[PDB]
């Protein structure tokens, strides 16, 4: 078809394989330990996900005893008490493609500070909001952590 | 955050923590799954496997390849989570990472 | 040479028996470099005897803020060539440090309209001078980003558009015309 | 005179010498020729010889001399990412530079899509000024001041 | 022997001959030099074929004998972390491997370039000791605990 | 005509020279020994200059004359597949290639291969089908539609 | 040749008419292995019609060990390929497996410093027995995974460290040295 001349080339055609096999030599291994440990956090992942899932219907059907029928007035009065909505910490970080942030929600709110007096069930009921926000928490970071590890593992690989 | 899934289960969303206000029937939910992102001001807003969680083009197709709250996977009524568990684990991981 | 080959009788033949060579490149000239030349390819040995001159006429250390600059235009291919791998994608943060720096280098500080006014020379003061504008720049660069600071900003600093003004300047306005950009540094880039 | 060589080949024993005989050169690709651009014209490395000194200044327009050397490595640092963007990905790149590439097939596929076009010395001046307004003073370290502002 | 090739290509006779006759290799690159590495030379692209036989136990430094296979194996090893700083970062690494890094550094810098001090071929062994302290006694894997346990 | 090529590229004009002059050209590709293919034949440049005339209809059986091609461009697209599998992931993909995977496999080993096997041109083609009983009538367009009926 | 090439007229030539190829790969030796031959690399057609005599004499079921054992580089070449940096871990288990025994042909069968004199001199009715040890350990090795036993346990079993030194083992002993050795499997496995 026509692609280039024919000397001098030699020399500088030369020093493709230098940069572009060499570069690439251990481009493949390095990317492998990001994703070696980052299994890591991925196994723990369902560690509290599995672990306050079924905790979570826990409190949720314990108090519908005596504030199941009576739950959407026991909800009125601390209902939202301190939903701040992101509040939450969030985290910025590398992965190719760019950088892209991550962040937990961790602040003193489900612990307990719906007031409005109430029964016995609200309490341990509200309790297990815990199980959600608190372990909600757990994939936001993690759970995320895995579709970065995708594109940068695709990406590199291809 | 204001994030709804299931309103027999959301309930104690609206209690504690956030509000969650979701169907058990509505599952399209997509009549609020836009809506909802209209503004999109909290973290990341998620709902249960049994409505468009498989299919998070839900999201993508309404937000337009833009970085907005994404969605989180679940079931509402549990059983054995022994089964979709290390297959969550396949289905990231097998269309890239893991191969076989 | 004919093809423009390197390699050619005429190349070899010149070769062994005259020091600091140099090369000529196609899309140099043709482009905005001048001269164009060949970045690399192109050394010096008299250079390292050619210190004495230099030492008094222009300063005791100047072949230090000269040798350590080369350190640069000649290491910053340290990245060149995985940019040539992959790109500014995956650039950290020392990343377009030198790329850039390296870069402006040649497009005000290295290419040299012989065909202007004054540029056309240039004498120590304004070799060496200049060889220490960005410098600056390089050194608040260096706790700026370290800092934390984001080589985002950084980018469009206004007073690094005045770093590229100064090859044009005669010797005359030169000397003053510099020092007060120099001060405009460490203030327009500390700060942000 | 006009001298064809084999396949795209520079170096051909041709403009060989003729190069240096010749003060200046023109180049043509084929790339253009084959898929639309018409006249397909290009002289990637050809800019002559004594074409910088004869115009600018008294005949032509002021600004001139400045202005081809600007729109030549404004250009290059263009199609430059052609490849780097066949190669990494699509939109990879900063959102700068994204404007280097996102003009070169502007520059070109415009500039080169001359037809019966008489284009005189100063309909030609103009489009210049037309392709560069998409980045501001800025990168336009070729030009003054004055006169790169002068026709924005 | 002492030489150049044309362009610096082993494809050359200047080279071929030689590499072939010769019984090592010592070569010199622009890299190494260009920061200032003064002499400017290589790790593993330099080295005398028979020079590892009449060294260590008797010859020269008893423990030169591993003492000499040492530096090598362990030094290169660094020369990783030294072109992907880009990647991560500085302390985006590992301590165990991002310490194999300083190690690079103070090595060419003081331990390659050298100018024209004179080594004495004992004052010339120490060094290495010295900059293997880098890695905490018992990470070189080259030479023996019992060596290393002693001069260190 | 049977013999080696150089190395293995019919660059040379060992086998080039050949091409023209010997009626079509077939090779091994010395991939399919290598790997365990026997008969290690590759269709890659296979197809005689006197096979066209005397087959098809008549000589043998009439659907050979119109399965010709549809293998053809059925295994081809075959591999091209298995290409950018290793290089996006083994999934990436549709339907649209899902089955020319498996029309790469079944073709590979399955069919090539066979030993000293004596298959016959009865015994070969026969099955020769069970091969495109996954491609539908519709991704295929090589036979009619008769023909694609007849031992499906 | 002197550069290490692969095709070159020297080489490619000498391949045009040989029988037997005995490639050494300078990595394998890098790592101070000896031999350290590289086999994806040799090749030797003699086997062929040297085959029928090797059991005719030596044992009936001699080469259909070898040849067996072989399979190594098979379920290797293109399992380590992969597997080299992930290494044991997504594997199920008999992943490993595959690859730890040819850490023992490859450490004791394959490594067979003909610098030493123990393991230097040999004949085929002893290596026959090596290579058959780390058979018969592994019909019932992967019999065991599969039917319920560990992967980084069976690994830790000393019986199977008698094997490296099989080689080792000097031509006469190794019958008397066989004869428990072997059988000491059948009865060291008996555990799990």
Redesign the interface.
């Known amino acids: 078809?026509?692609?280039?001349?024919?000397?001098?080339n030699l020399?500088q055609r030369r020093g493709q394989l230098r940069?572009?096999q060499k570069?690439?030599d251990?481009?493949?291994?390095?990317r492998?330990a990001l994703?070696?440990e980052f299994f890591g956090l991925?196994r723990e992942a369902?560690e509290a996900r599995?672990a306050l899932?079924?905790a979570?219907?826990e409190?949720?059907a314990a108090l519908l005893l005596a504030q199941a029928f009576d739950?959407?007035e026991?909800?009125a009065g601390?209902?939202?008490?301190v939903?701040?909505?992101?509040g939450?910490e969030?985290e910025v970080e590398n992965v190719?493609?760019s950088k892209?942030p991550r962040?937990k929600?961790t602040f003193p709110?489900?612990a307990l500070?719906?007031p409005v007096g109430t029964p016995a069930y609200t309490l341990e009921?509200?309790?297990?909001?815990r199980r959600?926000?608190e372990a909600?928490i757990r994939?936001?970071n993690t759970?995320?952590r895995?579709?970065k590890?995708?594109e940068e593992?695709?990406?590199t690989?291809? | 955050m204001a994030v709804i899934a299931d309103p027999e289960t959301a309930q104690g969303f609206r209690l504690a923590g956030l509000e969650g206000y979701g169907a058990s029937s509505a599952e399209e939910a997509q009549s609020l799954l836009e809506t909802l992102v209209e503004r999109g001001g909290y973290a990341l807003v998620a709902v249960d496997e049994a409505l468009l969680p498989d299919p998070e083009r839900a999201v993508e197709r309404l937000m337009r390849g833009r970085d907005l709250p994404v969605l989180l996977p679940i079931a509402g009524l549990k059983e054995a989570f022994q089964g979709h568990d290390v297959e969550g684990y396949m289905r990231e991981l097998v269309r890239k990472t893991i191969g076989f | 040479p004919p093809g423009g080959d390197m390699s050619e009788p005429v190349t070899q033949s010149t070769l062994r028996i005259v020091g600091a060579f140099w090369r000529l490149d196609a899309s140099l000239a043709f482009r905005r470099h001048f001269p164009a030349i060949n970045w690399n390819g192109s050394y010096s040995l008299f250079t390292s005897a050619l210190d004495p001159w230099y030492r008094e006429n222009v300063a005791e250390d100047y072949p230090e803020l000269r040798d350590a600059i080369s350190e640069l235009l000649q290491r910053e291919a340290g990245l060149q060539e995985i940019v040539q791998l992959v790109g500014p994608d995956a650039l950290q943060d020392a990343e377009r440090l030198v790329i850039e720096v390296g870069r402006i280098i040649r497009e005000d500080f290295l290419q040299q309209n012989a065909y202007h006014e004054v540029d056309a020379y240039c004498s120590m003061k304004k070799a060496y001078g200049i060889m220490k504008m960005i410098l600056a720049f390089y050194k608040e660069a260096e706790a700026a980003i370290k800092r934390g600071v984001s080589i985002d900003e950084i980018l469009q600093l206004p007073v690094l558009e005045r770093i590229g003004r100064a090859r044009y300047v005669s010797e005359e306005e030169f000397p003053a015309y510099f020092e007060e950009a120099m001060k405009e540094i460490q203030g327009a880039f500390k700060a942000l | 005179p006009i001298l064809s060589m084999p396949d795209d080949d520079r170096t051909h024993p041709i403009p060989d010498l003729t190069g240096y005989i010749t003060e200046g050169q023109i180049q043509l690709s084929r790339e253009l020729h084959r898929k639309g651009i018409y006249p397909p014209i290009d002289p990637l490395p050809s800019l002559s010889r004594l074409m910088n000194n004869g115009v600018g200044k008294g005949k032509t327009r002021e600004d001139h001399k400045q202005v081809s050397d600007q729109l030549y490595s404004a250009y290059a640092n263009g199609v430059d990412i052609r490849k780097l963007v066949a190669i990494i990905g699509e939109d990879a790149l900063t959102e700068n530079d994204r404007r280097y590439l996102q003009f070169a097939d502007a520059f070109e596929r415009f500039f080169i899509n001359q037809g019966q076009q008489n284009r005189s010395i100063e309909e030609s001046l103009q489009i210049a000024w037309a392709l560069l307004s998409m980045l501001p003073q800025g990168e336009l370290k070729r030009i003054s001041k004055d006169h790169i502002g002068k026709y924005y």
């Open positions: 078809s026509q692609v280039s001349p024919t000397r001098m020399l940069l572009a570069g690439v251990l481009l493949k291994k390095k492998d994703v070696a991925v369902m599995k899932d079924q979570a219907k409190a949720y739950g959407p026991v909800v601390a209902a939202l008490g939903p701040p909505l992101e939450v969030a190719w493609g892209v962040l929600a709110d489900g500070l719906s009921a509200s309790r297990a909001f959600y926000a909600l994939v936001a759970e995320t895995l579709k590890i995708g593992i695709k990406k690989t291809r």
